[PDB]
Amino acid sequence: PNFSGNWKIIRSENFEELLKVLGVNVMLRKIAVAAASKYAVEIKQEGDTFYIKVSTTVYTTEINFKVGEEFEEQTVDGRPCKSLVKWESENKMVCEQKLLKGEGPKTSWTKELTNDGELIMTMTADDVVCTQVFVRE
Numbered sequence: 001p002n003f004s005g006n007w008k009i010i011r012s013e014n015f016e017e018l019l020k021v022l023g024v025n026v027m028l029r030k031i032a033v034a035a036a037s038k039y040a041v042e043i044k045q046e047g048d049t050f051y052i053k054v055s056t057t058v059y060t061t062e063i064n065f066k067v068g069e070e071f072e073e074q075t076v077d078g079r080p081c082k083s084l085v086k087w088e089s090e091n092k093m094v095c096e097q098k099l100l101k102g103e104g105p106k107t108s109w110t111k112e113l114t115n116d117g118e119l120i121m122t123m124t125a126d127d128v129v130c131t132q133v134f135v136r137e
């Protein structure tokens with residue numbers, strides 16, 4: 001599997017519902033949904049080490065990790081967390097997150113490379129799953 005690429009979003013489902021679970025108010029939810037229709041994920045993969053840059057029009061952030069090694073990032077709604085990525089299969093990884101301070105919904109994400117050349121990213125907060133689909137530029 002080679003996740004490396006400049007990925008462009010083509011589909012985003014249930015993102016507003018995810019943000020609702022996370023306590024984002026309705027107006028900012030709609031604005032965030034609009035930002036998601038634009039956004040890109042750049043991946044550089046070397047073996048089990050991943051460099052990921054997620055960007056929208058006005059914001060960019062970097063996720064760096066090695067599979068199986070704890071690291072710190074933020075949840076979708078922006079709360080700092082400790083994260084651990086594991087493979088679920090040849091082409092799919094899963095990340096469990098634990099809040100660094102306080103409580104909140106159980107969050108996680110997955111990244112999958114399909115046989116058709118798509119990247120599928122899911123983000124979960126409790127029972128609500130957002131699914132996002134990208135293609136390479």
Ligand SMILES: *C/C=C(C)/C=C/C=C(C)/C=C/C1=C(C)CCCC1(C)C
Pocket residue numbers: 032035036039041052054055056063075076077109111121
């Ligand atoms: C492997 C790829 C990962 C973990 C990508 C994660 C992307 C996000 C958490 C992006 C979240 C966004 C917002 C919270 C609001 C603006 C739009 C997004 C989709 C960039």
